[PDB]
């Protein structure tokens, strides 16, 4: 009965930056791996970035270099830095965690990037 | 794949 709480999303201008937050909840047990997937409208869901408890991290090719995942100081909490956002980054972003051998998924938070900029 | 990283042991 682990609960994911995703925050930081919303409706943003092209070229701006955004940080998502995800806190896995209801466990005293550190995760093994935690990260983000995303679903562009009408497209399949795809992994974005993941980080293991050791700090070892993995990025999908479509975002590698543009996004950065990290461990917050808080128990079972990770951040996704999304820099230089573009309309193709528009998507539902889903947090996922693996704790004690079980995967848990968040409800997802929208990140929408208009083509208009500052 | 992304899923190979996800499932892998640390």
What resolution does the deposited structure have, in angstroms?
2.1
Interface contact flag, B2 A52, Cβ < 8 Å: no
- DSSP reduced 3-state for B7: helix
Classify strands A102-105 and A91-99 as parallel, antiparallel or unpaired. Answer: antiparallel
Tokens found for residue A101: 């051998």
Best residue in A37, A47, A51 for a mutation probing chain B (most B CBs within 10 Å): A47
No. of H helices and E strands in chain A? 0, 11
**Determination approach:** X-ray
Give the span between the Cα atoms of A65 and A62, in whole angstroms.
9
**Contacts with A46 from chain B: Cβ below 8 Å:** 2
Q: Containing domain of residue A55, as a range? A: 3-114
Cα–Cα distance for residue pair B3/B5, rounded to 1 Å: 5
Residues of B with CB below 8 A from A31's CB? none
CA distances from A20 to A45, A49, A81, A92, A101 (A): 18, 12, 7, 12, 25
CA distance A46 to A48: 6
Residue A96's alpha-carbon distances to A16, A21, A33, A34, A59, in angstroms, are 25, 12, 9, 6, 14
The total of other beta-carbon atoms located within 10 Å of residue A10's CB is 10
Q: In Å, what is the CA distance from A117 to each residue of A11, A22, A79?
A: 12, 27, 24
| Residue A101 falls in which region: left (phi positive, over 0), alpha (psi -120 to 50) or beta | left
Residue A30 near chain B (CB below 8 Å): no
In eight-state DSSP terms, residue B8 is S
The H or E element spanning position B4 is helix B2-7
Count of structural domains within chain A: 1
For β-strands A18-25 and A77-82, DSSP reports them as antiparallel
Q: Residue A9 sits in a domain of what CATH number?
A: 2.60.40.10
Q: Hey, CA dihedral for A51, A57, A62, A68, is it positive or negative?
A: positive
How far is Cα A106 from Cα A5, in angstroms, rounded to an integer? Answer: 7
């Amino acid at each position: 009965e682990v609960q994911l709480v995703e925050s930081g999303g919303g409706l943003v201008q092209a070229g701006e930056s955004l940080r998502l937050s995800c806190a896995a909840s209801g466990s005293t047990f550190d995760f093994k791996v935690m990260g983000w997937y995303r679903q562009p409208p009408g497209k399949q869901r795809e992994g974005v970035a993941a980080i293991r408890l050791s700090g070892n991290m993995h990025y999908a090719e479509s975002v590698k270099g543009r996004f950065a995942i990290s461990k917050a100081n808080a128990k079972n909490t990770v951040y996704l830095q999304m820099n230089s956002l573009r309309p193709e980054d528009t998507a539902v972003y889903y947090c996922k965690v693996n704790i004690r051998g079980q995967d848990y998924w968040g409800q997802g938070t929208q990140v929408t990037v208009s083509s208009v900029s500052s | 794949s992304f899923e190979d990283f996800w499932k892998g042991e640390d």
